[PDB]
Design a protein around this ligand. Structure first.
Ligand SMILES: CC(=O)N[C@H]1[C@H](OC[C@H]2O[C@@H](O[C@H]3[C@H](O)[C@@H](O)[C@H](O)O[C@@H]3CO)[C@H](O)[C@@H](O[C@@H]3O[C@H](CO)[C@@H](O)[C@H](O)[C@H]3NC(C)=O)[C@H]2O)O[C@H](CO)[C@@H](O)[C@@H]1O
Ligand SMILES: O=c1ccn([C@@H]2O[C@H](COP(=O)(O)OP(=O)(O)O)[C@@H](O)[C@H]2O)c(=O)[nH]1
Ligand SMILES: [Mn+2]
Length: 273
């Protein structure tokens, strides 16, 4: 009988220095994080966390960003005293990218590993600047990346729900997960915001200082061009969410790799139907 972890972690140091211009060596990060177990799993040795968190990263062709992510997050997530695992959902193939479908795959496959009850959905190029910005679930859906540098350290609009967010297992199931048919860039986070509002929820957020986040500057990805149907799509979420999401999801996992600091699920999610 380990006792419960304190409600807020005593380990946190607050604001942090973040930079992206040095090389990163994941063997060395592994050695700096000796307590992270194979597949990027950690829980505290001294107490039991109520936070059973799968962190889900949609991914293709961003290995350099991913090493920064893992270098910065792993120490922060342990200081937060979370029982967590990292999942990188790698889109097989070279056709148009589908962020939100990959996120659904992540939810469904992490559940096969462990009784996770919280899901964090994080883009791979967003790093929090303050470890008081909690990477776990709340009684309402949680928007985490609230004051990104690239939007002037505030929200680009008050209904913005992109970047990094957290939903409990019950919140995600309540909205039928995320939509599967936003192919290419834009709009799927707005649809997900729509979904939560249509199911009676509201967005919880840390303050702008605690929520300061850095984005790793990068040029445009090929095969994730702006989706021209995105404006039409987000205008119909209430109706389309009933039968587009978790209850219409299929995919084929091609490969699961347990690396020391993460599990990578390589997955064929198809093209538009
Ligand atoms: C529905 C949707 O697209 N939601 C996303 C939202 O989009 C807002 C806005 O983004 C603009 O691109 C920005 C981008 O968001 C920034 O991250 C980046 O730094 O710079 C880009 C350049 O400013 C789009 O240009 C804009 O699209 C335009 O929207 C108007 C109507 O509002 C249309 O009439 C016009 O046709 C359309 N133009 C083009 C060229 O496509 C619009 O998408 O941005 C957030 C934050 O990035 C995303 O998370 C949301 O998914
Ligand atoms: O080719 C791609 C496209 C996007 N992504 C992932 O999806 C997120 C969202 O895309 P992004 O905001 O970076 O697009 P952009 O800034 O170019 O408009 C990224 O942070 C990555 O986690 C990826 O891994 N490879
Ligand atoms: Mn980006």
């Amino acid at each position: 009988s380990l006792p419960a972890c304190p409600e807020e972690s005593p380990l946190l140091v607050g604001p942090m220095l973040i930079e992206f211009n040095m090389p990163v060596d994941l063997e060395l990060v592994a050695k700096q994080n000796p307590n992270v177990k194979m597949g990027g799993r950690y829980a505290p040795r001294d107490c039991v966390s109520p936070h059973k968190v799968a962190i889900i990263i949609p991914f293709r062709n961003r290995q350099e960003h991913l090493k920064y992510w893992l270098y910065y997050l792993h120490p922060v997530l342990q200081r937060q005293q979370l029982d967590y695992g990292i999942y990188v959902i790698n889109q097989a193939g070279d056709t148009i990218f589908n962020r939100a479908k990959l996120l659904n795959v992540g939810f469904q496959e992490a559940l096969k590993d462990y009784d996770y009850t919280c899901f964090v959905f994080s883009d791979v190029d967003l790093i929090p600047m303050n470890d008081h910005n909690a990477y776990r679930c709340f009684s309402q859906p949680r928007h985490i990346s609230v004051a990104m540098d690239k939007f002037g350290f505030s929200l680009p609009y008050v209904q913005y729900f992109g970047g990094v967010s957290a939903l409990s297992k019950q919140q995600f199931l309540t909205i039928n997960g995320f939509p599967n048919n936003y192919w290419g860039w834009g709009g799927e986070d707005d649809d997900i915001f729509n979904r939560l509002v249509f199911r009676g929820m509201s967005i919880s957020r840390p303050n702008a200082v605690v929520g300061t986040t850095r984005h790793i500057r990068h040029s445009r990805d090929k095969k994730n061009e702006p989706n021209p149907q995105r404006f039409d799509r987000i205008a119909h979420t209430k109706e389309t969410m009933l039968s587009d999401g978790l209850n219409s999801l299929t995919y084929q996992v091609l490969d699961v790799q347990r690396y020391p600091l993460y599990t990578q699920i390589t997955v064929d999610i198809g093209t538009p139907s």
